[PDB]
Design a protein around this ligand. Structure first.
Ligand SMILES: Nc1ncnc2c1ncn2[C@@H]1O[C@H](COP(=O)(O)OP(=O)(O)OP(=O)(O)O)[C@@H](O)[C@H]1O
Lengths: 50, 48, 49
């Protein structure tokens, strides 16, 4: 049961990572003050990967 | 109208290069730019 | 009588201000510039001093 839980979590995490990273390319360099762009950083956490 | 000119003029001038003296640590003086007591503080703009 | 006055505010080696002295007015001083121009930074320098 624990193995199945871990596997499903990994699959869902990968799917959401891919979706968000693909979505990131939907922004086109907004020029606000000195900020030249905005981006989302999604990464599986190592403290949880362990 | 003088004020409304000065501001605008400065806005146009500061887009053109920088002033190298601003790194010298020597404050600039308040040069009078008309009668009635109007003054301006800016180093010469050298580095375009 | 003759209230004391802040006559100036000097930042040295601050972010964007290597050596900048502002001459505070006796009544009102007005920093003015677009976003990121560094006005809250100047007021932070004053407060920190
Ligand atoms: N703690 C900080 N670390 C890094 N950069 C900072 C920090 N605080 C401010 N900055 C940057 O310094 C520049 C000036 O910041 P500041 O807050 O002084 O802007 P400002 O001109 O007062 O802005 P606004 O008019 O929009 O309030 C901006 O690029 C801001 O991103």
């Amino acid at each position: 049961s624990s193995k199945s839980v871990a596997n499903i979590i990994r699959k869902t995490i990968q799917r959401e990572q891919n979706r968000i990273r693909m979505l990131n390319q939907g922004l086109q360099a907004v020029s606000f003050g000195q900020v030249r762009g905005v981006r989302l950083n999604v990464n599986v956490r190592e403290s949880h990967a362990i | 109208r003088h004020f409304d000119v000065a501001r605008i003029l400065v806005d146009q001038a500061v887009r053109l290069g920088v002033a190298e003296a601003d790194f010298s640590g020597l404050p600039a003086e308040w040069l009078a730019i008309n009668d009635y007591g109007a003054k301006v503080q800016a180093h010469v703009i050298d580095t375009y | 009588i003759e209230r004391g006055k802040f006559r100036s505010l000097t930042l040295v080696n601050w972010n964007g201000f290597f050596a900048r002295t502002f001459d505070l007015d006796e009544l009102v001083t007005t920093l003015s510039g677009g976003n990121g121009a560094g006005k809250s930074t100047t007021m932070a320098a004053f407060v920190t001093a």
